[PDB]
Amino acid sequence: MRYLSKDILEEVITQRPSDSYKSNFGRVVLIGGNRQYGGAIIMSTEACINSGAGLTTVITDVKNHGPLHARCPEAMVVGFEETVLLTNVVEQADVILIGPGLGLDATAQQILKMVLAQHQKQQWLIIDGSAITLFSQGNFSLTYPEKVVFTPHQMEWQRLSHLPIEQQTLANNQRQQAKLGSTIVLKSHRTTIFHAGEPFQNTGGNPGMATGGTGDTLAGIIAGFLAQFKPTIETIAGAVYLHSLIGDDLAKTDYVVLPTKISQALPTYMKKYAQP
Amino acid sequence: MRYLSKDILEEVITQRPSDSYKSNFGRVVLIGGNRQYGGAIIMSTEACINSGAGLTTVITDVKNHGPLHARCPEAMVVGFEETVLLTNVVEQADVILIGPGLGLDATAQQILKMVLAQHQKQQWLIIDGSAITLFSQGNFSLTYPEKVVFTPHQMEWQRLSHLPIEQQTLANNQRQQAKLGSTIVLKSHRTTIFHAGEPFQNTGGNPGMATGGTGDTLAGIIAGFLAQFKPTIETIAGAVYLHSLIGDDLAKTDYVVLPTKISQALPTYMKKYAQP
Amino acid sequence: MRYLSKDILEEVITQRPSDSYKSNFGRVVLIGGNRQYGGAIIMSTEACINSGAGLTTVITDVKNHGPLHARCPEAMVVGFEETVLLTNVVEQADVILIGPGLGLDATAQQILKMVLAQHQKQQWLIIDGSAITLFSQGNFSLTYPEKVVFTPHQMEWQRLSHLPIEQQTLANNQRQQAKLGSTIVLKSHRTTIFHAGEPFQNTGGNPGMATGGTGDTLAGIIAGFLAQFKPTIETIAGAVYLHSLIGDDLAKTDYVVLPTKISQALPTYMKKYAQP
Amino acid sequence: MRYLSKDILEEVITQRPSDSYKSNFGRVVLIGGNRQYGGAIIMSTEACINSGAGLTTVITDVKNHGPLHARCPEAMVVGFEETVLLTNVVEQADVILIGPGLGLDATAQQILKMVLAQHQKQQWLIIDGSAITLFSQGNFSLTYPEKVVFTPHQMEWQRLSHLPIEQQTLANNQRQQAKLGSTIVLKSHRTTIFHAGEPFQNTGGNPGMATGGTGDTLAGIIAGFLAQFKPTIETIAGAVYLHSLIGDDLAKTDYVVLPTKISQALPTYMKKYAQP
C-alpha cells in the first residue's frame, strides 16, 4: 500500500511543453444533472475546467444550460434530447464522467447503456454516484474494464460488490476489485484506491468537506487529470490527494469547505507542484 | 433572561467529529419564492449552505431555479408543481423552513397546510414571513408545537398573538408564547427569543442591516444551525447572535450591509468560535 | 452656482438612527429593460440596492428576471404583462425611476403615460434615457413638476428643451428648466443640475466612464438617494457627485471604469462620508 | 519583421481626451454562439467590454441571452431570429466580429453572407473560427479586403490558403495574405500577423493558455482595440501582444490560465501602458 503525500503530485502533474495545443490536454464529456440536481454537474464542470482539461463538453438537462454557462462559459452544452450530437461527443471523448446529479430514470439508464456499449479501449470511463447504482442493477459486462473507474462511497460499494460495510476490509475490497478488473476509488473518511497494483491510501480529508457537492468536485478533478496526465492509476491518486489537500487547507479557516472553493484553487495549487 | 454574547457561539458551534458524513449535518428543505420574490428564497439558501447544512433542497417556483443554481449549485431544486417529489422531500427533511418570498396565494396556503399536517416530532419547523400570516389566518392546531419556530417581526407578531406593538412587553410576549407552546423569535431592533425556558435577549443589530433580504438570511442560518447542532433553543439563539455579529462587523465599513455578505462570512466566523 | 465637493456628501448622507426599519429607507420602483437592453435595468438595480434603498422593485421584461436575480436577489421582479401588480407597486412607490433600457415601443409609452397619470405629490419621479424622448414626443402636462427629475444627456435635452447644443448655456438652460418647473440633471463631461434654486456644478468625471451603463448606474444612485435622504435637490447633487468621485478614483487604476464597480463601491464610500 | 514588445502597447493605447463620449470609442457587434457554444460568445463579449469598447451588441442565440446578461449586463442582446434589428445593428457597427461559437449551419452561413454583402469601407470585419471555414467554403469576393481581418489557427489557415502546415512559411504565408489583401492573424504557439506591411511577430504565449475560450477572448480584445484606436494593423498587434502578456503573467501563478481572468485584467493593464 502506498500512503499518499505531495510526492504523488510532483509525479503526476507535469510541466506542459512550450508547443502544446488544447486537444493534447484531452476532450472530456461530463454526463449528469437531471432537472432537480443540475448543480451537481455544474460543480463537476467547474472542477474539470479549473483542473486544466483541454475541452469540456457537458451532457445535461437543457434546464441546466443557463446556470452552467453563467458559471462555466468554457463548456460546450448538449441536452439529453440531442441524440445524434450527444452520441457524437461521447464517441470523440478521451474521458467520460457519468453520474453527478444523474438520478435513476429511464433516460439515465439508456445513456449509461449507450456509453458502456460504445466504450473504446482508448477512453477512460468514470462511473460515479447514481451511475454506480444503475450499473449495479443492470448486469452489464465491461468490454475494457481496465479503463473504467468507479467512485463509490461505502454504500454504493455495497451495491456494486455485495460487501457489507463491516466486511469492506483491504483484502475483501481487493478481491472484489479483482473480480471487476476496474479501478475502485472507495470514498470514505480516508479514501482508498484499489486497482491491479498496490492500493493507494489517501491521507487527508476533514469533516468540513462533508457537504453536498464535494464528491462532484472530486469526480471532475479525476476526469480533468485523466484528460491530461499519464494513463496510470497514479494519476487518479493525484487527483484524490489534491482534492483533500486543498480541502484540508481551506478547513484551517473555513468551518465548512464549499466545493466551488476547492475548484477555484486548482490552478494555483497545480502550479506549485508541477514537476520542474 | 440571558443576554447573548459570544459564549452562545462557543456553546452551540461544536467541532465536527473526524468521521462525519453529510447527513449527520442534517437535511433541510426551504420553501418559498413565488414568481415575484424568488430572490428571497435564494438568499435563505445561500445562508443555509454557508452555515454548514449537510444537504439543502429548495421548493420554489421553477422560474427561480436558474438564478438559484447560478449562485447556489449545492442545492437540489423542486418546483411547486412536482407534487409527489415535494411531498417526499418534506417527509425526509430534518428541518423545514417555510416563508421567504412565499407570498399569500392558494398554492402557498396548500403547501403550508401539507407541511403542518405531516409535521413529525423529530422535525424542526420554521415558519417565517408571509407563512406566519397564513398560519394566523388558517386556524391550525400544531401537533408538535415545541418543534415549531416562528420568526415574526413585530407586525406579524400582532397578527399571530393579537398583542399590539405597545403591549408587546416581556411578560405579555411570554404569555402568548406559552399559549402556542412554540418558540417565538421576535425580530426587532434588539431581537428576543421566547420559549419554555428563560428568554434570550440579543445584543447586536444595526440600521445598516435594515435592507431587504436580511430576515431571509437569518431564517436560512437558523435552519442550518438546527440542521447541525443540539435540538435546544440555545442553537436558535446562536444563529440570531451570529447573524447580527457579522452584520455589526460589516457595518463598521459598509453603510448598508448586503445580506449575501453576511452569508459569505459564515464559514470563517463559525471556525473562529467552534468549541475546541 | 454651487461647485460640488465632498461637503455635499457630508451634508446629504446622514447616519441612520439606531431604531430604523427598511421602509424608513424608501420603496423604489425601477422601470425599464426591454428584450434587448435588460442589462441596463440590471445595472440601475445593482446601484439602487448598493446605495441603501430600503426595498427595490423592478418592472422589466420577464426575459430579464433570471439574470437580474443572479446578480440582484434583493429585488422584487414584475413583468410588463402583470398589469394589476405593476400598477400596485407604482402606486406604493416612494421613488419611481423610468427609462434605463426602456426603448421606444407602445408598451413603453403606455407605462410612462400610466406613471405620469398617477404621479402623486409625495413621490419622486425620475425620467431617464428613452423615457425623456417619449415624454418629449407625447405632450404631457406634469401635475407635480417640482417632484420630477429629468436626467438628459445633451441630445435628449435638445429634444426636451429645443436648445441646440451650442445654445445650452447656463442662462438658457435655467430658463428652460423654469418653463418645466422640474429638476434637470444635464449630463455632460461636467454635469450641471438646474432647479428652482442655485444650480449645482459637478466637478468630477473622466473619459474612462464613457462606457455603456454608466448613466444607468447614476440613475439608480439618484433613485436610492431620494429613497433615503432629505427631499431637496442637494440629495440629487450628492448622488451625482458620489458617482463621479468613485469613477475618478477607479480611473486611477482602471483604463475603463466598469459601472458595476462603481455600484459595488457604494457601501464603503457612503460609510466614509456619513455625517457623524 | 517587427518583434512585438511593450512598445506596441505604448504606441497603440492612447490616453482618452477629457471630453470623450461612448460612441467615440466605437460600436461593436459580436456575432456567434449557437445553442451548444454560447459560452464562446460570452467570453468574447467580456473581453470586448473590458477592453474599453464604447458599446457592445451581441447577436447570438436567444438561449444565450440570460447567462450572457448574468456576466455582461453592459451588452445589448439580439437573437438570430430578429432579422430587421440584427440587420440594423450590423449596418451601424464600426467593428463586426463574426465566429466565436458560431458553428457551421445554414443560419450561420446566411448571417456571414449578409455581413459580407453589406460590409462597408469604414467598418472593420473580423472573421474568426468557424466563420473562416464558412468563408473558405463559400467562394466570396471581398469588396473591402483591407478592412477584413482573419484570425485562423494553422488548420483554418490551411482551409483558407491551401498551405499545408509544413509550408506555412513566412514567405508563403505572405504570398497568400497578398492574394487576399486582408490581415491574417495566424495563431500558433507564437502568433504572426501578415498584412500589406512588415509582418508582426508576437513574442509571448504559454501552454497554460491552451484551454477552450482563449481564442474567443483574443478575438474580443482585437474587436475592442479596433473600436477605439487607430485604424492601422499595429492596433491588432497591440491586442495580440496584450492578450499574451496578461496570459504569461497569470501563468506565473496559475497552471491553466482561465480566459475570463485575462479579460478581467484588461482595465489595469491598459492603464499601465496608456501613452502619457
Side-chain angles (χ1 to χ4, degrees), chain C residues 1-18 20-138 140-274 276:
Chain C
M1 190 167 249
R2 176 182 182 164
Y3 291 83
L4 297 180
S5 69
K6 75 194 240 170
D7 69 349
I8 195 69
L9 299 178
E10 301 169 335
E11 178 177 335
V12 165
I13 302 170
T14 54
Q15 269 153 220
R16 303 186 160 182
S18 318
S20 317
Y21 349 107
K22 279 198 312 311
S23 231
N24 313 43
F25 304 120
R27 293 179 187 263
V28 183
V29 177
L30 316 182
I31 311 177
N34 74 1
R35 281 175 218 111
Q36 294 83 13
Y37 299 124
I41 203 64
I42 295 165
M43 297 182 287
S44 290
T45 303
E46 184 158 23
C48 185
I49 294 160
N50 272 284
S51 79
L55 287 179
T56 300
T57 305
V58 182
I59 301 160
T60 182
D61 201 282
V62 60
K63 184 181 175 187
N64 304 325
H65 294 184
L68 189 163
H69 274 160
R71 307 181 55 93
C72 298
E74 309 76 0
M76 177 192 189
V77 295
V78 178
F80 291 136
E81 82 279 15
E82 308 182 61
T83 48
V84 174
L85 187 49
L86 84 85
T87 302
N88 290 346
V89 298
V90 164
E91 169 184 55
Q92 294 162 18
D94 297 310
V95 183
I96 304 157
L97 162 63
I98 185 167
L102 184 60
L104 298 159
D105 53 87
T107 52
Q109 300 162 37
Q110 177 49 37
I111 294 168
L112 181 60
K113 185 200 178 170
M114 187 271 305
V115 170
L116 291 176
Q118 71 76 54
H119 181 222
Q120 42 215 77
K121 178 141 181 121
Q122 60 231 130
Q123 287 178 325
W124 283 101
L125 181 53
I126 310 161
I127 302 179
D128 174 61
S130 79
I132 301 175
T133 303
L134 293 183
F135 178 92
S136 85
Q137 290 182 20
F140 298 92
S141 110
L142 296 170
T143 307
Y144 307 105
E146 76 279 358
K147 278 296 210 283
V148 184
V149 182
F150 287 94
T151 57
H153 55 52
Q154 290 196 275
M155 291 292 325
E156 287 156 347
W157 183 226
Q158 184 171 209
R159 289 189 187 105
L160 193 52
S161 82
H162 281 13
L163 295 172
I165 303 309
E166 192 196 38
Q167 296 303 127
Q168 291 179 16
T169 85
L170 197 147
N172 290 339
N173 289 333
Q174 187 65 263
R175 290 188 193 97
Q176 293 304 307
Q177 181 281 135
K179 165 152 181 170
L180 283 154
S182 294
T183 299
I184 311 304
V185 180
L186 180 56
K187 293 179 318 178
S188 69
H189 84 296
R190 294 284 184 278
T191 295
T192 312
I193 307 166
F194 297 88
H195 64 116
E198 195 199 19
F200 296 101
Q201 173 72 66
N202 200 37
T203 56
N206 67 85
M209 297 169 63
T211 184
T214 297
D216 301 321
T217 297
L218 178 57
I221 302 173
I222 296 167
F225 263 50
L226 285 172
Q228 287 172 85
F229 300 128
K230 272 200 68 186
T232 64
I233 303 321
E234 278 84 2
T235 291
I236 300 177
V240 170
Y241 185 76
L242 179 58
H243 170 85
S244 59
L245 178 72
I246 298 169
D248 285 353
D249 289 347
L250 288 171
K252 295 178 189 153
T253 48
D254 293 7
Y255 185 74
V256 63
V257 180
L258 294 176
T260 299
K261 296 195 68 184
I262 294 176
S263 297
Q264 289 174 344
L266 289 167
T268 53
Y269 275 76
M270 292 180 72
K271 180 73 180 188
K272 205 188 165 184
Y273 299 97

Side-chain angles (χ1 to χ4, degrees), chain A residues 222-272:
Chain A
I222 296 167
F225 263 50
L226 285 172
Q228 287 172 85
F229 300 128
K230 272 200 68 186
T232 64
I233 303 321
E234 278 84 2
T235 291
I236 300 177
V240 170
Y241 185 76
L242 179 58
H243 170 85
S244 59
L245 178 72
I246 298 169
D248 285 353
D249 289 347
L250 288 171
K252 295 178 189 153
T253 48
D254 293 7
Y255 185 74
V256 63
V257 180
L258 294 176
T260 299
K261 296 195 68 184
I262 294 176
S263 297
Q264 289 174 344
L266 289 167
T268 53
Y269 275 76
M270 292 180 72
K271 180 73 180 188
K272 205 188 165 184

